[PDB]
Structure 1
């Protein structure tokens, strides 16, 4: 189980991969049975391919907007901003990903909180 410090490291690593757009590298960070709920409120996405599909569908710039809050039970929450093009126009989306990592430092749970209210032009 990653330590509070390792969680900070992994979560930041995740943002870096989304930012560069390395789907393969992003997918590899997920445990086998990892689930993704993005946005939180919608059906969880399960499986390597579906997740890769989800990220390819999505990937865009992403960067932390605050430090990773990490716990001692391999979990963490981080605030970030996604820069993308929507309705043919440059937009921003504020998100908070809550993640639970496993013993191998792989992502078991990803929950991204955000909705239209967090959408900005």
Structure 2
């Protein structure tokens, strides 16, 4: 595809959350441009490239059980970008905890994620 339209951004960003929710690390990584960046949380230096991004998703999703779900609609733009609110549910030392996040993404002219910025801080974690 080309630079995604607003509708296409909403579909891609929702599909990303679906893939996170099931934990399909390889399918998630494919959604990113080969040279994409991730800033997690926003405020920390970016990681770069699909192998580092794969390592990030292996670290986050390969361990205990993880779920993720949109908590409201994707807000998209007409320049290939969007923002979405979601909650991640996981386990910490065996006890159920959640993290509220907003991801901001920019897509490239092939429909792949060029940049991802995950807004959250420690108070967004609840046990």
Q: TM-score w.r.t. structure 2 length?
A: 0.93
Q: Compute the displacement of 1:87 (Å).
A: 3.2
Match of 2:89 in 1: 83
Paired residue total? 121
What RMSD in Å do the two structures reach over aligned CA positions? 0.6
- Please give the alpha-carbon distance, in whole angstroms, between the structure 2 residues aligned to 1:87 and 1:96: 25
- The offset of 1:88, in angstroms, is 2.9
Structure 1: any 5+ residue segments left out of the alignment?
A: none
Unmatched 5+ stretches in structure 2: none
Instruction: Quote the offset at 1:33 in angstroms.
Output: 1.3
The structural deviation recorded for 1:92 is: 0.4
User: How far 1:47 moved relative to its partner?
Assistant: 1.3
Q: State the alpha-carbon separation in 2 of the partners of residues 13 and 103 from structure 1.
A: 18
Cα deviation, residue 43, structure 1: 1.2
Aligned to 1:103: 109
Q: What's the offset of the Cα at 1:38?
A: 1.0
Query: For the residues of structure 1 that align with 2:45 and 2:93, how far apart are their CA atoms?
Result: 24
